[PDB]
UniProtKB/Swiss-Prot annotation, chain B:
Listed EC numbers: 2.1.1.45
Name under which the protein is recorded: Thymidylate synthase
Oligomer and partners: Homodimer.
Pathways per UniProt: Pyrimidine metabolism; dTTP biosynthesis
Top-level lineage group: Eukaryota
Active site: 170 (nucleophile)
Associated clinical condition: Dyskeratosis congenita, digenic: A form of dyskeratosis congenita, a rare multisystem disorder caused by defective telomere maintenance. It is characterized by progressive bone marrow failure, and the clinical triad of reticulated skin hyperpigmentation, nail dystrophy, and mucosal leukoplakia. Common but variable features include premature graying, aplastic anemia, low platelets, osteoporosis, pulmonary fibrosis, and liver fibrosis among others. Early mortality is often associated with bone marrow failure, infections, fatal pulmonary complications, or malignancy.
Entry binding sites for (6R)-5,10-methylene-5,6,7,8-tetrahydrofolate: 193
Protein family according to the UniProt entry: Belongs to the thymidylate synthase family.
Record location of the Glycyl lysine isopeptide (Lys-Gly) (interchain with G-Cter in SUMO2) cross-link: 262, 267, 283
Protein keywords: Cytoplasm, Disease variant, Dyskeratosis congenita, Isopeptide bond, Membrane, Methyltransferase, Mitochondrion, Mitochondrion inner membrane, Nucleotide biosynthesis, Nucleus, Phosphoprotein, Transferase, Ubl conjugation
Length: 282, 283
């Protein structure tokens, strides 16, 4: 079968061959509605035509599981991707003055384990408050794997205003058939250049983690896009990437048996056979 | 130009050749596939499937019902649409522990989530003004002020309210897109019976995309139907195979007889599907 990465690339071509020109501007070729499927059967979708910040992926996900909404908690691990939206300055440009530095608000972490609970600050303890979606999802996979209501949604219209940054991961569904676990992510906005690759890895990792705990095997991962765009700043770099030939995907391994989703630790994972192409500038 | 219904029948074809056996809530076998997407042009035509008639009166009347924010199945039944009565009956409500609800009270379903998301639900006769987020109107407001915005979502999945309604929303969420004065829409359906409900669904949001376009003075663009659990009942394989052989006829055309300016001002009499001739029934 066709190397999975070809889909991501097959899309970049489309965004350019049919994307229409159009915050902070910077320009962008957009497209509306796309879907790519990546296999998780004895392989992990970690694009090779360009290196992917695996540590960021793995370290950020574990950060969501905890339900943490503190940018600092994640940066203290070396991943500074969420710091910008945590700086005292930014929080101010949003009206959030009483807000402590590092507080992102009811973002992913909060939505995943305390959906619906009234948000206060990153320190407050929301235990027993809200709906623990991540856990309910795991529980259903276990007792009713044929359920078509296994959905985890981070889009809370009532909390959007309090967020330092709106979700680009409205929701994701889980599917179980023949002992194989699949997941479909619905991204409202995707930066094909510096985001989608990270995103693919992010949710494919979650599927593995979930499949491990439910005692199932990973299947497919459907990445569905709403507004897929390319920033003109990447029109060149990417044009070079397309040149590159996709190398066989690496493999993910869970070095130890784990019971609860929270018990997962960074050291529990290993990426073997990851041979990505060089890195120019982007 | 390739006909639009070919995209639909194509998915039925995919399910047949690649779908696997999967049981539903009652134990009934179905042939399933996870993750699907289809695009339907809404430009000078309306995607109302023709290889099998679609209950248009039901689509149109049910949509109107959602916009009102109604959760009373009676209000819909009093229009000829009986698709929500079973879920609101006296017996079905008791068996769910809702013995204190008057007949017809569906719970915080679609209507409520669209106009009052997050509002504290009481009953189908309580007033929820100013309560909750009017996602519907917010969509219209955004399409007008910031057409390039890519956070124009209308989510009906409310984890908190799920255990208070008849059954979980089938239409998790939809997103609107605007480009070159055209309004495109994408729907995410978590579950869909390819031959029984998907058609009805395509017509619902195609019509909604027509109404929002009308109000914001834009032209209908495309409708992307993204499915999660696409399936067909096993005992429906044979009749479906017959339908597949049928040749799709030109999609009809929808018309807005008068000029409407508010989403809530739309009436059933304001619509007209001209040129609809679907194939005869099959079984």
């Amino acid at each position: 079968p066709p190397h999975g990465e070809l889909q991501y690339l097959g899309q970049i071509q489309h965004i350019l061959r049919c994307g229409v020109r159009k915050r902070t501007g910077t320009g962008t070729l957009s497209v509306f509605g796309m879907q790519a499927r990546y296999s998780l059967r004895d392989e992990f979708p970690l694009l090779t035509t360009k290196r992917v910040f695996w540590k960021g992926v793995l370290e950020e996900l574990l950060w969501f599981i905890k339900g943490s909404t503190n940018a600092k908690e994640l940066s203290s691990k070396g991943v500074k991707i969420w710091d910008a939206n945590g700086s005292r300055d930014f929080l101010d440009s949003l009206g959030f003055s009483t807000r402590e530095e590092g507080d992102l608000g009811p973002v992913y972490g909060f939505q995943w384990r305390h959906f619906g609970a009234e948000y206060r600050d990153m320190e407050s303890d929301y235990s027993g408050q809200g709906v623990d979606q991540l856990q309910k999802v795991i529980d259903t996979i276990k007792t009713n794997p044929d359920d078509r209501r296994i959905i985890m949604c981070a889009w809370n219209p009532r909390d959007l205003p309090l967020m330092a940054l709106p979700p680009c991961h409205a929701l994701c569904q889980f599917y179980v058939v023949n002992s194989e676990l699949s997941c479909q992510l619905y991204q409202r906005s995707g930066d094909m250049g510096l985001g989608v690759p990270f995103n693919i890895a992010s949710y494919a990792l979650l599927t593995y983690m979930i499949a491990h705990i439910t005692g199932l095997k990973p299947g497919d991962f459907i990445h569905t896009l709403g507004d897929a765009h390319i920033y003109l700043n990447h029109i060149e770099p990417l044009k070079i990437q397309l040149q590159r030939e996709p190398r066989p995907f690496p493999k993910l391994r869970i070095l130890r048996k784990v019971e609860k989703i929270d018990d997962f630790k960074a050291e529990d994972f290993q990426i073997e056979g990851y041979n990505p192409h060089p890195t120019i500038k982007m």
